[PDB]
Assembly symmetry: D2
Homo-oligomer: 297 residues x 4
């Protein structure tokens, strides 16, 4: 299979179920809204060793927000409900309630399940909290240094997907990295999705467990490490490839992960030096969500 003149292996990505809450952060302008979102979603690449998986989803124009100001929608992910509930409180309470000019609202107003993050954080007012309605949302005003911080009572969450992905293989590292940046920019416009790794790009890659150091939970996936292909049997790196990068995608549903994957691949293949596009899986075992690349075009 070829896409934009680039070879795309007819294989699949294997994803997993995960809980995801969608939050809307607004501010004076996009800069301040972003300052808060970025801080609240850092240290959030993988649940392997990060408190959660998080990222900025998409910008929100004044015409679409409750208070009529510019903002950003962000996603915070965790394997368990209580875990996600815990992440929302810590991240929004330590990184957004404390950020300049911010106000937070529910990013999934029609969600089945929701947690009372607003009700809990408002206790920060130590008794001076007030109740207010902003564009129809029921909120709380928390008096503090800059003025009144406004936060909706609840935040909705849903059963999403984590681990959507695709690999980019190229002739040099720069070519692979530029293809990966293109993919991330392209994916940034896709609603309902995020790319949690640094800059949204994975430079490491991984395999469950290890072959030598059994005391590890995950190690380098030597079969996709170009610098040691001569030393690895059954290596998946072609003779002309010197570098590989992966794009990991978390999303509210399968259709969104699928669109993100197509959009990302389409853009990546525009960069000279790209040799091959494929994706990572676990042989059909472990995963519950499978994305077949040949079904994307």
């Amino acid at each position: 299979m070829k896409v934009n003149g680039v070879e795309v292996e007819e294989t699949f990505a294997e994803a997993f179920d995960i809980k995801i809450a969608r939050v809307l952060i607004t501010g004076y302008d996009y800069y301040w809204a972003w300052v808060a979102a970025n801080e609240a979603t850092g240290f959030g690449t993988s649940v392997i060793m990060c408190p959660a998986e998080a990222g900025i989803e998409i910008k929100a124009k004044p015409s679409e927000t409750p208070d009529g100001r510019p903002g950003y929608y962000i996603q915070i992910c965790h394997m368990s409900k209580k875990g996600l509930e815990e992440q929302l409180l810590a991240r929004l309470g330590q990184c957004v309630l404390t950020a300049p000019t911010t106000a937070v609202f529910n990013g999934l107003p029609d969600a089945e399940e929701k947690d009372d993050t607003g009700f809990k954080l408002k206790f920060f007012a130590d008794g001076y909290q007030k109740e207010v309605e902003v564009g129809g949302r029921k909120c709380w005003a928390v008096p503090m240094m800059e003025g009144d911080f406004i936060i909706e009572n609840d935040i909705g969450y849903t059963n999403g997907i984590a681990g959507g992905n695709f690999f980019i293989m190229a002739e040099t590292q720069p070519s692979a990295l530029a293809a990966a940046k293109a993919a991330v920019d392209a994916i940034s416009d896709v609603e309902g999705v995020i790319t949690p790794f640094p800059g949204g790009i994975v430079a490491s890659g991984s395999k469950v467990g290890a072959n030598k150091y059994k005391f590890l939970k995950a190690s380098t996936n030597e079969k996709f490490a170009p610098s040691i292909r001569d030393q690895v049997e059954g290596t998946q790196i072609p003779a002309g490839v010197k570098a590989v990068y992966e794009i990991v995608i978390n999303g509210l549903n399968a259709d969104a992960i699928k669109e993100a994957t197509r959009v990302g691949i389409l853009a990546a293949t525009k960069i000279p030096g790209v040799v091959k596009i494929t994706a990572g899986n676990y042989g059909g075992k472990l995963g519950k969500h499978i994305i077949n690349l040949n079904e994307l075009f």
Copy 2:
């Protein structure tokens, strides 16, 4: 005291003791280094509910790096040795070892005490790791998708200070925010320091524990909340002040904290609308380090 025509209260900031590790991250250019530093230092405003207090210290020119590539020094802070070693492994292992083009070196080559974070993280190579020396530093090469990740064997840490600060009072919110942003920019050029909060700015402010909710580790500092000055008897908000913002500073030592405080105030007072400058403190024997504002100007 008067600085640039503005009223500065002759009081003090009450800082606390904290462990600080200094890490140098390099990459192709400033953008890629920043991407790694940014991800690794997020969700790190306060130890009250964040896994640590982190932030970008200063830009590192190629002329000053072991590999001759552009980079950034970052600081990761924690109250104890185990937690810091812990945060170093998690943030660097999940946010820097995974980010494109990066290499990590000891940001405090000197310093007696250090953690062997490099030695532990190299196990990720599962036996394919190799020793290599870069710019006179003992590092490890970890094969992965992008190529080889280079990391020094050890990272140094020292007894630093967290909690240096000053408050900015203005006639309107935008005026207080503009001065706060001006302070953050000026402080960015100061070596050995970081401003942990979002955008480096504190919009909330906190006090003892709580009046009504003793189940809170901290609550709003109502005495500095202009929106409720009326129903507050010991309010520290002068009549015409409608907004306040705080700047928290963490750093390697007192001289650095004092420099950052001085530089931030000088810049803050250039903004129209600023009426008063002060600092926050508590019980004498509660915070070890005191920073008297009257000794900085």
Copy 3:
């Protein structure tokens, strides 16, 4: 008349006729496309002393571009046809054909009037040009150091409007500025419009000639200068106002100018400290296009 609680004067803006060309610039990703668009539209705030009035209109998603890669649409304006053709060849030839990874396409495909800028610039190939069709567009490939620069044969231009506007009055300079920045951000999502001044904001403001220096083509509009209200008898500055900022808007048609004016004001009035909103005119004796604030809300 009040908007969001802020008073809006029931007056009008007086704009003028101008020629406008719309160009699409694409690259590896948004950064590189922005690099070219930013350089090409610089030194272009006003026709009084700049070679032209220009600016970045809006983002162009990969799904909307002829080549499927990210980009930005920009507008370049001039009073005459000859002057506009000249500015297209100079700005695109010197600032886009020379920038990394770009390609340029016709941003107004259905316009009847066009300039053959592509045809002229391709001579730079000195005999090595080659014709190529991209996404249905007739183009030329120009080999140079980086590879081949792709540029459509021509660019469409239309009769647009310059000078759409509104003034923002506030209690402090930071308040008026934050409001203006809020409006610029909101207006950045509006199609068919550009905000030509630095950061899209007018900090000066001007009037036809000059009372004391008749050799000037324009001078400060004293009736709107806060700092000297006590020395100007016809001052239009209310008592509590210390700073004013203007937002100038150029665009393809009246409906666009109108939408931008409306969205800008809505955003601006969300900033604390804003006291009044109005607009600039010249008695209706100069501009053909009048924008009544009354009809926007």
Copy 4:
């Protein structure tokens, strides 16, 4: 010759004499100072068809400016005195005097040759002009909408150099581009120099006249165009190079150009895929300034 393992041809760069004025622009913070500098330095890549060659030189810290505010130093270049005098009036009067919060000062106080830019632009005040002294500099306050614009009345200039350069050849377009990017970032820290092309990088390149279209004053240097190497018959592009990027350097003196050239090359050779490093000249006849690469290392 080898630098960081990369082959560096033992040739030279051939530069020319040009008039350069240095201007300091300050604002509330680095963001606002940048907005004005950016706008004022755009549409300025080459005097061939641009009004001038301009760019941002280096950041200016509060401790270094006359008003104690953050800012940026920019360079505006022109071949003649009067052309330079005019470019200062237009760019600064149209792009800085109009940008939010700015103040301008002389960037070369010790230069005997100076232009009275400030004295002429203050006529904008139409009589309400007022003299003020800031940090020892003699300036003018010009009343306007945002308040009072402060500008020193004189701006110095000197006989500088235009055309410093070196070429980066790589196996892929992304490889050469990342190399040139790194070089620009590395040069941004060098005092007294600027990189005038888009993002500071030249993707085109050129030769004096033309081989086929003689009415042209310049055209593609086909001997350095990778895409037509099989054709040229005089190509200077080695078999394995697919793309080339050039970095043009302008500066106050020779020492500075050399430092910038050295700094750029060193950083560029750090990027994987770079094959060769050389520079552009004209047989040593056209330009007066020669920079031999072999004497920089």
